[PDB]
Amino acid sequence: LPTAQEVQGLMARYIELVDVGDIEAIVQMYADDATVENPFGQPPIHGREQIAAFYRQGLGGGKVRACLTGPVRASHNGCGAMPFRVEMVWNGQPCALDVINVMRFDEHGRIQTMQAYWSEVNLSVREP
Amino acid sequence: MNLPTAQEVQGLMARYIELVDVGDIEAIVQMYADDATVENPFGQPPIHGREQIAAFYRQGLGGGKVRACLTGPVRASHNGCGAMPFRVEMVWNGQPCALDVINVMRFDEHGRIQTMQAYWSEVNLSV
Ligand SMILES: C[C@]12CCc3c(ccc4cc(O)ccc34)[C@@H]1CCC2=O
Ligand SMILES: C[C@]12CCc3c(ccc4cc(O)ccc34)[C@@H]1CCC2=O
Numbered sequence: 001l002p003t004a005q006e007v008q009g010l011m012a013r014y015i016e017l018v019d020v021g022d023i024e025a026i027v028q029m030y031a032d033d034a035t036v037e038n039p040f041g042q043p044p045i046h047g048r049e050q051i052a053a054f055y056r057q058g059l060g061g062g063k064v065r066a067c068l069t070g071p072v073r074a075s076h077n078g079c080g081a082m083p084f085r086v087e088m089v090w091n092g093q094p095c096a097l098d099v100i101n102v103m104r105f106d107e108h109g110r111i112q113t114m115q116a117y118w119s120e121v122n123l124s125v126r127e128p
Numbered sequence: 129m130n131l132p133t134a135q136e137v138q139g140l141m142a143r144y145i146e147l148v149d150v151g152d153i154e155a156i157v158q159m160y161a162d163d164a165t166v167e168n169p170f171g172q173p174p175i176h177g178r179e180q181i182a183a184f185y186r187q188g189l190g191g192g193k194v195r196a197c198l199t200g201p202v203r204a205s206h207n208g209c210g211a212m213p214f215r216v217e218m219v220w221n222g223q224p225c226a227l228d229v230i231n232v233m234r235f236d237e238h239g240r241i242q243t244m245q246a247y248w249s250e251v252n253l254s255v
Contacts, residue, residue, distance in 0.1 A: 004249045004250070004251045005251055008251055039205060039206075040205045040207070040209060041205040041206045041207035041209070069200055069213075070199055070200055070213045070228065071228050071252060073228060073229060073230045073247040073248045073249070073251075073252050074247070074249055074251055074252075075169060075170045075171035075247060075249060076169075076171045076249060077170075077171040079170060079171065079247070080247060081211065081230040081232065081247040082230075083200050083203075083213040083230065098200065098201050098203060099203060100203045100211040100212075100213065100230060100232075102211070102230075102232060102247070117203040117204070117205055117209065117210060117211040117232070118203050118204075118205075119134045119203075119204055119205055119206055120134070121134045121135055121138060121204055122201060122203055122204070
């Protein structure tokens with residue numbers, strides 16, 4: 001079960017994989033039975049295959065970047081929370097979306113749950 | 129207020145940090161639901177209810193040398209929840225220190241905090 005420093009490393013690695021759009025590697029980070037709520041408030045998605053579909057739809061068109069915008073906060077029970085900005089182009093408008101992800105890892109270092117907090121108030125038009 | 133909208137969550141969470149920054153313990157307590165929980169740091173057992181929460185804030189802030197400020201926007205959902213990054217400044221071992229924290233909060237249908245989870249550990253403390 002990852003220590004606080006191992007959670008910092010895994011959550012930063014997740015943002016690196018999203019930033020380069022490596023869909024297959026992101027899926028590998030999740031437990032085969034993980035659940036993702038993105039954005040939090042929506043019905044969850046459950047398991048690897050649904051999760052893969054999610055990342056393929058969100059990142060497969062390219063033109064998405066993601067970067068930490070502050071440090072990962074990590075707990076002593078395998079959990080942590082991080083702030084980051086997602087950049088995209090939405091029907092010609094360059095946009096930034098500010099997001100905080102909360103993750104719980106399992107005893108194999110895989111993401112068991114993820115909750116991404118954001119809504120449209122966190123979108124803005126902004127050059128990369 | 130009923131269940132706060134995303135914009136209302138952003139305002140309430142920002143207000144909470146303002147009140148921490150000036151040490152207004154009684155106003156902080158009034159932001160929580162009468163039976164709210166606080167987990168601070170997340171990973172420790174929850175405390176329950178306004179008196180335990182008041183005691184916790186009096187212990188944390190009552191020395192008067194704590195400041196706090198947002199270090200990015202409040203993220204808000206459409207179901208009355210939100211998350212925010214901020215930095216707390218205080219003294220550790222005789223020197224000025226800073227601690228990065230993220231709070232995740234859920235508001236009830238009266239606009240009061242029902243649950244508080246403050247994510248941080250020693251990996252977030254710097255001098
Ligand atoms: C899906 C998305 C691009 C990726 C992305 C979004 C929002 C939250 C995210 C959180 C993640 O952990 C990883 C990727 C996203 C955007 C919402 C609109 C959009 O095009
Ligand atoms: C208590 C504290 C100052 C305030 C504070 C801490 C940690 C998380 C917090 C979360 C809050 O929502 C409000 C205040 C704090 C610090 C931990 C050590 C310390 O001096």
